[PDB]
Each structure stands twice: as C-alpha cells, then as structure tokens.
Design an enzyme around this catalytic site. Structure first.
Site, PDB file in Angstrom:
ATOM      1  N   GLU A 133      39.511  42.210  43.479  1.00 21.30           N
ATOM      2  CA  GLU A 133      40.909  42.543  43.179  1.00 21.30           C
ATOM      3  C   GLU A 133      41.193  42.505  41.679  1.00 21.30           C
ATOM      4  OE1 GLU A 133      42.902  44.366  45.625  1.00 21.30           O
ATOM      5  OE2 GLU A 133      44.359  43.144  44.500  1.00 21.30           O
ATOM      6  N   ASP A 162      41.581  37.671  37.375  1.00 19.05           N
ATOM      7  CA  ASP A 162      40.685  36.953  38.280  1.00 19.05           C
ATOM      8  C   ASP A 162      39.349  37.676  38.453  1.00 19.05           C
ATOM      9  OD1 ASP A 162      42.751  35.032  38.684  1.00 19.05           O
ATOM     10  OD2 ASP A 162      43.490  36.056  40.491  1.00 19.05           O
ATOM     11  N   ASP A 168      37.338  38.221  40.996  1.00 17.39           N
ATOM     12  CA  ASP A 168      36.920  38.872  42.243  1.00 17.39           C
ATOM     13  C   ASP A 168      37.243  40.363  42.221  1.00 17.39           C
ATOM     14  OD1 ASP A 168      39.663  38.867  42.642  1.00 17.39           O
ATOM     15  OD2 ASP A 168      39.604  37.288  44.150  1.00 17.39           O
ATOM     16  N   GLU A 213      47.535  38.675  35.079  1.00 15.46           N
ATOM     17  CA  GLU A 213      48.394  39.168  36.159  1.00 15.46           C
ATOM     18  C   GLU A 213      49.781  38.542  36.235  1.00 15.46           C
ATOM     19  OE1 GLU A 213      45.461  37.519  36.594  1.00 15.46           O
ATOM     20  OE2 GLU A 213      44.174  38.576  38.050  1.00 15.46           O
ATOM     21  N   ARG A 216      40.451  31.304  45.943  1.00 18.07           N
ATOM     22  CA  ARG A 216      39.888  32.313  46.836  1.00 18.07           C
ATOM     23  C   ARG A 216      38.379  32.278  46.801  1.00 18.07           C
ATOM     24  NH1 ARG A 216      43.641  35.257  43.999  1.00 18.07           N
ATOM     25  NH2 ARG A 216      45.635  35.314  45.159  1.00 18.07           N
ATOM     26  N   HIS A 234      32.186  31.057  42.522  1.00 16.22           N
ATOM     27  CA  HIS A 234      31.257  30.215  41.785  1.00 16.22           C
ATOM     28  C   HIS A 234      31.301  28.792  42.323  1.00 16.22           C
ATOM     29  CE1 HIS A 234      32.498  33.550  39.301  1.00 16.22           C
ATOM     30  NE2 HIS A 234      31.605  33.296  38.363  1.00 16.22           N
ATOM     31  N   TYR A 236      39.549  28.066  41.288  1.00 12.84           N
ATOM     32  CA  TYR A 236      40.028  29.287  41.942  1.00 12.84           C
ATOM     33  C   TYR A 236      40.097  29.121  43.455  1.00 12.84           C
ATOM     34  CZ  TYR A 236      40.710  34.354  42.595  1.00 12.84           C
ATOM     35  OH  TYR A 236      41.213  35.597  42.929  1.00 12.84           O
TER      36      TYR A 236
END
Length: 688
Positions: free
Chosen positions: A99, A95, A97, A8, A328, A373, A326
């Site tokens: 998104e 990522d 998740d 990204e 989030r 995780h 991470y």
C-alpha cells in the site's frame, strides 16, 4: 540545502520532522492521491473518447488503468508540486508494505520529480530508526506496486461484473465485495448449522467427596467428581452426539436419563467410594509468541473488548506517535535489541527465575520480507515504561495506553520461563446395588506460573473454556482409599449448538483459511457490518436476512467466487506477484479472460470471470433468491423469510376464503436472530 519528505498523515509528518530537524520539510499526502474514476466526471476530456474510461481499466490493452487525481486531493497535489519547486531532494517515507509503496509510486507519477529521489522505509518511528532510513534508502519495489495494482484492478473488475447481478437478483444499491462475501458466507454457514442443530439430553451424577476421615491431612479435604462408567459401559457425554442429536457411530455408551441417574444415586446413598487410581503427570507450557496483526486483534477483542477496527485505529496512533512498531505484520520475530529489552524488563519486574534460560526467538516465515520485518512490540531500543506512557496518554487517550500495556505485557511475557505444574487424574469406584460404577475427577496445579505472571490469554466469550492459569485443586489420594459421599446430585444436560463467531474468532478463521491478510482483517470485519450483511448481538456476529439471500445466490449460481480454497489461492497468487514470481498482466489476463494457469477448477481455469458471470441470468428467479426456507409448519406448509424492499417478512401459502394459493404474512426485524425464529416463534407472529 532543502529536502522535502512526504508521508501519509499529519501526525506522522509532525513526528518525523521532530526527528529529522533542519533542512527537511515534511508534508502529508492524506493517503492516496490518485484512484480509478469513481464517476463520469472523474474522466478527463482526453479520455472521454475511450469507452472503457469510466470503468477505468482497458482490458483489451493489458489492463492499462486510468488513474486520475480525486477532486478531494487536487488541493494536496497542487501544494506538493508547489513545494517541490524549491527543494534539492525528495524523500518518500510512506509505509513499507505494498500500500505504502503504491502511494510512493503514485506520488512519483504525479509529481514527476526532476531531482534525486530517496525512498525511506522503517518499521518504527524513533530518532535512530528515522535517521537510519534517511541515510540508507531502498529502491522503489515495482513488484510490490504491481501486486497492489493487480488487487485494485481485480476489485474494479469484480465489482463491474458481479454488482449488476446483485442488483437484478437481490436489491439495488447492494455492493459486491469478493472477500467480504466469503467472510459473510462463513458467518451465514455457522447460522445455518445452528438452525439445523438438534439438542440431545443426557444425564450423569455429580458427587462431593470427603477424604478427611481416611486422610486427616488431605488438601483440600473435599472435592467433586462425575460418574463416568456404569457396569463397564461409558456414560454418554455431549461429544457423543452429532448435530442431529443422535449418538455417533463409535464405541458403546449408555445415555442416562433422569430416572436412570437418580436410581444409580439412591442405590449409592449409604456406601463409601474407593480411590482406584490416582495419577500425576507434569506439564510445561511454552509462552505465547509476540503479537502479530491477527493475534493482537484477537486478544484486544477478547480482553479489552475492542472491535478489530478500533484496535487498528488505536494501533495506528501508537505507531505514528512512536510508541510501537508497525502494526500490519505477520511476523512474530523480535530484533536482538527487543529480545534483550524484554528479558531485562522481565528480570526487573518478576525476578531472575522468571526469565527464560536462554533468550527466546520466535522466527516464523513471513509471506514477504519487504513488508514485514518484526512483531508488534514497543518501539525503541529501550521500551517506554507503561507508567510513563500512562501519563502521556491519559484522559482521552486512555484506550491507547490500554493497547500499549497489552503489547508491552505480551512482549515481556514472550521472553519469560515456561509455566510448570501437575495434571491430576482420578478413578473413583463404588457400588450402586448390582452395578459397579466409576466416578472421575481431573485436576491441574500451577507449581510455577512463569510467563503467566505477565500475560494470560483470554478465552473466547462464546466458545467458553479454561484459562491457562486456572487450577483445579485435588487432595493427594492413594489407591484403596475410602471416600465419604457428601452429596449426590443427579445432573441433567443438553448438547449446545455450535457457537457464533466473535470478531476475535472470525479473524482467527480468516487467518487459518488463508483468506485474511494483516492489511485486510479489520477492513473485512468492518465492511460486512456497515453494508448491513452482519450485525452484533453482544459480542456475537449475526448475519442479516439479506446476507442469506446474497450468500445463497452466490453459492447456487457462482459457487467458485465464494469457495474458501479458491479465495485463499488468489490471495496467495497476489503475494506471488508481490515477490516477483508471477506477472501482473498474466494474472489479470488469466483471471478475467480465462487461461490454463491456476488451481484446478478455479475461475481462471473455467473460462475466466467474464464468461463465468455472463451466463443467462433469466434462468435465475429473483423471487426465490429472496426467499429463505425455514421449515414446514404442523400442516406441511413451507414457511420462508422473504427479503423485500420494505425489509424481511415471514410468508406462507394458506387456504383463503376461496382456497389457495393465499399468502399469509407477518413482519420481521433485527430482534429475532435466524436461529431464534423457530416454528413456535413463527406461528406466534402469524397470529398476533
């Protein structure tokens, strides 16, 4: 032998390349590449014949979306397709998740690869972690993609139905935001409470007592104590009054006033007091869990004074640069590598004694195991030391170091020993003439600080309170012991209104209510401020007058849309989709068109969003929507705040040169918070 890897961001692209090496080409996609149309010009010729195209969702065909490539990204896509021509394999390394999965999916839909595709997922950017994820790809999780899309469509449909109502009834150019308007409501609800608050006064007595004559080795020889009982009746405290300033229907108390209290003190002036009851109880504080998204935003707000948005931009850079895991996440679990690194770090920094007896696991159930995780902790099997990170992130990156240090200290502390101490309790008696009186003192000792040597939470600015390493020294006292009265001060007090939210306490509220998610807390807090609904007075969040008007409209006429429980339930169902336990299409269909599924009395069970909103709105008076009742004046006349196109101004109906109805007006700005605009204040600006 050429492989392409897509991520990204340029930072993340440069970082992964450093770890992957030769025979890998790592490119950035600037986040999302497709979205629903944002303008008529976003609609391709092929779809200009579909009346639903501009909306971008075909509700009569199972909510088929129209995804187009945004003009700002057409360039990016072109280059990506160009590069794809020349590789043997495609790696999607967004990522993990929903998104990130959605971005991967969109890249697949856009690039249409005719070569093998591997999907890399990792929660830290280190050479081992990157190598691992490359060697052991994960299948694309369609359930994740469906959850992200459901939410995207929901937002589009919500805006489509609700914005026009805000435009006709409040102000043009207002933008609907469903979760946002709930966050806004929380803030407005608190302001109303503050506005309806009424203080009560209550008095007691504060004494300085000396124990040194009765015990030459008391430590400390002096201390403070408060009057707690008079003639068997318990003295009124703040907790004893309700928000209207009247005593709660509980046990029986005396409210003292100034003359009351000083009579008691004068009648005491002369005597000694006697220790009637000393008690020690030990206590043991367990250390904080490792950081997750909400607790990190909270502590960064209270300690470093960073906004939620700031914390997330910084955390983003730390993560992309290989410093942390991470950011989030709703997990507080540490991997066994991390538990051992923390234990070791702690033993090295503070001692073998400050290390927890056995290793400490903080395994709390995560909403979805695919997206989270691990807790937020320093990356890599051995944590980069704070000094080493301080040198790399010096100067302009100083806020990055400060956040890293906070995360490092929290992780290390989480593996440390319990705090130990004693809590001291005191009942002092005496005689003020006729009545017997009880003074009370309490105290806390920290015999053994434990993890508190490494990390102590910061108390909320507005709520106030005591930190978890604060100590109140009290001398060892024994029943029967006489005490000398050093000073007696009759003490007056008033109840305070409920505190406003800081960002930290708003995030806490969003989490407890189940409305916020790790991916959404900061964007929620950020948007309600951008869009003008809320602003900051110091560290406090204060709603604007327009916030009252919108919140009022939604509460009065569309209450389900801003109900805390209904909102939380929807957040949960979206997570249910993400897990594969509820279907995208069924959910959208039930929500928009109505159905028999969902929490009782929810939008879905009440006929759906479309029927809900499309009531007759002519019954809703714009004039009243933009009028916020404050109070009546000393003549019985309603004084309200009108939200006008020129902004907020105060108005009341008065008797004119002929008579009434005559509106008397006065203009208003930010300088006056809602609970500050009292009748006194109002009269003062109607006249000058």
């Amino acid at each position: 032998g050429r492989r392409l890897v897509i991520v990204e961001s340029p930072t993340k692209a440069r970082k992964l390349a450093s770890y992957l090496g030769s025979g890998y080409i790592v490119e950035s996609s600037r986040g999302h590449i497709r979205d629903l149309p944002r303008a008529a010009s976003d609609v391709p010729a092929k779809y200009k014949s579909q009346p639903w195209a501009r909306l971008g969702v075909n509700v009569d065909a199972d909510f088929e979306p129209l995804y187009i490539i945004s003009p700002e990204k057409r360039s990016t896509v072109s280059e990506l397709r160009g590069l794809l021509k020349d590789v043997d394999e495609l790696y999607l390394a967004t990522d993990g998740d929903r998104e990130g999965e959605a971005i991967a999916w969109h890249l697949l839909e856009t690039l249409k690869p005719r070569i093998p595709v591997k999907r890399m997922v990792f929660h830290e950017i280190t050479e081992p972690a990157i190598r691992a994820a490359a060697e052991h790809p994960r299948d694309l999780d369609i359930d994740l993609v469906d959850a992200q899309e459901t939410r995207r469509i929901l937002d589009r449909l919500y805006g489509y139905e609700v914005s026009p109502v805000l435009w006709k009834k409040v102000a043009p150019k207002l933008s609907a935001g469903r979760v946002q308007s709930v966050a806004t409501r929380i803030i407005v609800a608190r302001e109303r409470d503050r506005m309806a608050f009424r203080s009560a006064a209550y008095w007691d007595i504060l004494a300085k007592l000396d124990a040194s004559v009765s015990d030459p080795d008391a430590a400390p020889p002096t201390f403070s104590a408060r009057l707690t009982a008079v003639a068997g009746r318990r003295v009124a405290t703040g907790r004893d009054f309700d928000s209207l300033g009247t005593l709660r229907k509980g046990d029986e108390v005396i409210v003292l006033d100034e003359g009351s209290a000083t009579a008691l003190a004068a009648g005491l002036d002369g005597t000694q007091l006697t220790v009637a009851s000393a008690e020690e109880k030990p206590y043991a504080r367990r250390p904080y869990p490792p950081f997750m998204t909400s607790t990190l935003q909270q502590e960064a707000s209270r300690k470093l004074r960073f906004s939620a948005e700031r914390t997330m931009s910084i955390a983003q850079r730390l993560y992309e640069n290989g410093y942390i895991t991470y950011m989030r996440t709703d997990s507080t679990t540490l991997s066994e590598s991390a538990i051992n690194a923390a234990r070791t770090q702690a033993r090295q920094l503070y001692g073998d004694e400050y290390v927890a007896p056995a290793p400490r696991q903080y395994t709390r159930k995560v909403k979805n195991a695919q997206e989270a995780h691990e807790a937020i902790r320093p990356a890599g099997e051995t944590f980069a030391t704070p000094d080493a990170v301080r040198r790399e992130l010096d100067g302009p990156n100083i806020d990055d170091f400060r956040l890293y240090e906070l995360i490092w200290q929290r992780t290390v502390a989480s593996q440390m020993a319990d705090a130990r101490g004693m809590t001291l309790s005191l009942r002092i008696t005496g005689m003020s003439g006729h009545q017997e009186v009880v003074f009370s003192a309490t105290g806390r000792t920290l015999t053994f600080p434990g993890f508190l040597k490494a990390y102590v939470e910061t108390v909320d600015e507005l709520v106030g309170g005591e930190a978890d390493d604060a100590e109140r020294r009290l001398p060892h006292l024994t029943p029967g012991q006489r005490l000398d009265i050093v000073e007696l001060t009759p003490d007056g007090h008033a109840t305070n209104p409920p505190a406003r939210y800081t960002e930290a306490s708003l995030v806490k509220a969003l989490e407890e209510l189940g409305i916020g998610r790790p991916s959404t807390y900061s964007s929620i807090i950020k948007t309600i401020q951008d869009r003008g609904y809320v602003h900051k007075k110091g560290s406090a969040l204060v709603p604007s007058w327009v916030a009252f008007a919108v919140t009022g409209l939604l509460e009065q006429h569309f209450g389900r849309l801003v109900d805390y429980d209904f909102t939380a339930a929807m957040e949960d169902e979206l997570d249910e989709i993400a897990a594969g336990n509820e279907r995208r299409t069924n959910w959208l269909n039930n929500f928009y068109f109505g159905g028999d599924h969902g929490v009782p009395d929810s939008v879905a069970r009440s006929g759906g969003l479309k029927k809900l909103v499309g009531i007759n709105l002519e019954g809703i008076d714009a004039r009243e929507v933009n009028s916020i009742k404050l109070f009546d004046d000393t003549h019985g006349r309603p004084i309200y705040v009108r939200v006008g196109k020129n902004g907020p101004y105060l108005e009341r109906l008065v008797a004119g040169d002929t008579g009434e109805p005559t509106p008397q007006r006065a203009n208003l700005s930010d300088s006056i918070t809602p609970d500050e605009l009292t009748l006194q204040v109002a009269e003062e600006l109607f006249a000058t």
